[PDB]
Chains A and B, each alone.
Chain A
Amino acid sequence: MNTVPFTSAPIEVTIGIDQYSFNVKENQPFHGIKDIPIGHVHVIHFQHADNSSMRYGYWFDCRMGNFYIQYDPKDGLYKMMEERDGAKFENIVHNFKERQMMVSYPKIDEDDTWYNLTEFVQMDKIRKIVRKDENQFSYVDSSMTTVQENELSDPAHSLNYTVINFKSREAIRPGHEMEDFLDKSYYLNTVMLQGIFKNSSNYFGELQFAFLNAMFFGNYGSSLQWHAMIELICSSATVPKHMLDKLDEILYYQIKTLPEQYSDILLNERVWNICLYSSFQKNSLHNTEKIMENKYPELL
């Protein structure tokens, strides 16, 4: 069980750790989060009480280093940093734990929700989508644009998701225009899976990362990417049985976790109606279709 200590909390903030959230008051003796499960990526995220503009946060994996949070009064944000001195770090964490100045990652023993949202998400793949190679953790916020959004502006602060575009020469083989537009199997299986992702695990990891940035930060480009990657599968007549069954599970947990009050801004009516009711895979997503029809019958 790993720990992300905080130097202090000088500004009132809502702190997210994965799907959990805690309100901290201005100058409250909050010194961090303990008992963080090893084996998963994690996201620690922030919304300031005095300016809800900019949700921002840090993707990290405690296996890769010792990370802490320190408020920067110049840049006005809680920053993640790495502590290279193992013994200094262990000594700080022991003191804060002894004085019970840390909140406990509040995982229920039965509860596989975080595993189920992050099954395919790996820190090494996050670090290729979010490029800042001097840090082992990745900063994301509300306003960061995608490479595809910047094509349609600062490249260093961009989300480098895989560009998916149904009306592109990459998506459409010369001489198979109708075939490739109406059945995206070529684009899914040869171009994206064999060509770019190498396997369904990397494809699912990107889809799951896109959903979590959409949900936790309200990142609009992330929401577009999540829907494009769902639509590419649902619009393909030929998909491996194992990929369809896994996609059903992935989407079920995403729809289960989504706050009901955010469904109107996070779910695209066109894409979900098309995927569940018109697409080649309209009858392949049993679990997802059932939770969508019971939780969000309005959207459909």
Chain B
Amino acid sequence: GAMNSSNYAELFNNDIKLFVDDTNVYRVTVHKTFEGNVATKAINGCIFTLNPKTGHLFLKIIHTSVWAGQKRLSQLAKWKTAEEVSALVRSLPKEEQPKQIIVTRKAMLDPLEVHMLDFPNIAIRPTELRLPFSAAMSIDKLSDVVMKATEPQMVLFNIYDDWLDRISSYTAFSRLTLLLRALKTNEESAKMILLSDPTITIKSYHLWPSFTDEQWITIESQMRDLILTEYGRKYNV
């Protein structure tokens, strides 16, 4: 059933699994019309499909053309997500197909279950974890490839860069979730922390800066301070 704090190590075992987050699939700007009514304009979105053990990110870019002449877009967006995840699984060799797919939002369960009826041995699960994958579009290189797309495109990233050379998957996921939570809570402050020292750069083939082990501990502390600072600002506590 549902994935929580009770079964957290399960993420880093040898059973292939993917998280699917649909929160950036259908994205709009709300604006006034000439007549003073309100309209939406869609912008490019993405499915965030992540293997938490390997760091492999299947970023399916959703181009605005897929919404053209469609109705009930927030509903269609869940079914298009499920269609694309189903297509991704069918495209993988059998030994690379996941045994489990965890959806970050319960509204994805029925669409994904219906698209995956051909895969009765793939478990479709919700999670009790509050994951900050909505902040993926705060990673400059991911935002750039989504906004520049002129057509539907899949791009493959490793969201952990080379961290698994030095740290376990558990620790890499913990670092990723802390970085994304900070970017979600105060994007400007998080990006300032990550980029404020010019001597530490982002390699061309990486998403995050090239921090030494000691520098990552400092960064991690500054991110925890940001989240606590923002929590004190929110609640006046």
Contact = CB atoms under 8 A, between A and B. Distances in A.
Interface of A: 167-169, 172, 174, 177-178, 181-182
B84 to A, nearest CB: 12
B110 A177 contact: no
A178 B117 CA distance: 13
B113 A178 contact: no
Interface string B83-118: 100000000000000000000000000110111011
Interface string B202-214: 0000000000000
Nearest to A181: B114
B217 interface: no
A263 B115 CA distance: 36
B164 interface: no
B113 A167 contact: yes
Given A178-B111, A181-B110, A168 B79 contact: no
Interface of B: 75-76, 79, 82-83, 110-111, 113-115, 117-118
Contacts of A181: 110-111, 114
B111 A167 contact: no
A168 B117 CA distance: 7
B100 to A, nearest CB: 18
Contacts of B76: 178
A175 B111 CA distance: 13
A40 B38 CA distance: 62
Contacts, number: 24
The DSSP consensus for interface residues of chain B is helix
Given A169-B117, A177-B82, 11 more contacts: A167-B110, A167-B113, A169-B118, A172-B114, A172-B117, A177-B83, A177-B115, A178-B111, A178-B114, A181-B110, A181-B114
Closest 10 CB pairs of A and B: A178-B79, A177-B114, A181-B114, A169-B117, A177-B115, A172-B114, A167-B113, A167-B114, A172-B117, A177-B79
B120 to A, nearest CB: 10
12 contacts: A167-B113, A167-B114, A169-B118, A172-B117, A177-B79, A177-B83, A177-B111, A178-B76, A178-B79, A178-B114, A181-B111, A182-B75
Nearest to A170: B117
Contacts of A182: 75
A187 to B, nearest CB: 12
- Among A177, A181, A182, chain B packs the most CB atoms within 10 A around the CB of A177
Contacts of B110: 167, 181
Given A178-B111, A181-B110, A167 B117 contact: yes
B69 to A, nearest CB: 15
A166 to B, nearest CB: 9
A237 to B, nearest CB: 14
A9 B118 CA distance: 56
- Among A168, A174, A178, chain B packs the most CB atoms within 10 A around the CB of A178
A30 to B, nearest CB: 53
Contacts of A174: 118
Contacts of A172: 114, 117
Nearest to B112: A177
A140 B39 CA distance: 60
Contacts of A167: 110, 113-114, 117
Contacts of A178: 76, 79, 111, 114
A172 B115 CA distance: 9
A163 B111 CA distance: 22
A172 to B, nearest CB: 6
A137 to B, nearest CB: 40
Nearest to B78: A178
A176 to B, nearest CB: 10
Nearest to B110: A181
Contacts of B114: 167, 172, 177-178, 181
Contacts of B79: 177-178
Contacts of A177: 79, 82-83, 111, 114-115
A109 B195 CA distance: 90
B145 to A, nearest CB: 27
Nearest to B82: A177
A174 B114 CA distance: 10
A167 B118 CA distance: 11
Contacts of B75: 182
A181 B83 CA distance: 13
Nearest to A175: B83
